[PDB]
């Protein structure tokens, strides 16, 4: 099936894209939640 | 029906891969 | 597979270029 071959090629390409997204998502969320937790706990210490 | 089945499978694959990011980000955000 | 590979590369390029704006704006916004 030509569609089967296209989908199988897409599966391999998708793993590259989701690997890229994950490596960026981790670092970005580590920074935003850390500045959110920082501002929150400083104000709680008050 | 072959191109419909494989094109639909591509759409579901895309939703599944990205939804994993969306859920992780949302849960962690509301968790803090 | 050539048109699939280059069309997919175009999608990833577009995500990468715009995501740089999104991350910068979001970080600076929550920073203040």
């Amino acid at each position: 099936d030509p569609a089967k071959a296209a989908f199988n090629s897409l599966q391999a390409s998708a793993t590259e894209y989701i690997g890229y997204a994950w490596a960026m998502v981790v670092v970005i969320v580590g920074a935003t939640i850390g500045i959110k937790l920082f501002k929150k706990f400083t104000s709680k210490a008050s | 029906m072959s191109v419909l089945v494989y094109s639909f499978a591509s759409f579901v694959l895309g939703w599944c891969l990205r939804s994993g990011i969306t859920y992780f980000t949302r849960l962690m955000e509301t968790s803090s | 597979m050539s048109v699939l590979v280059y069309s997919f590369a175009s999608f990833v390029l577009g995500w990468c270029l715009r995501s740089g704006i999104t991350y910068f704006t979001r970080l600076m916004e929550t920073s203040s």
Binding site: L10 | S7, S10, G14, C16, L17, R26 | L4
Partner: peptide, 29 residues
Amino acid sequence: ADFDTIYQAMIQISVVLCFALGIIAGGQR
């Protein structure tokens, strides 16, 4: 070039568009 050429190219374009629409749909919180 040939009908088969157009057919195969169109199918590959379709799956890569459906994946992109899938990412946009999945990224809606």
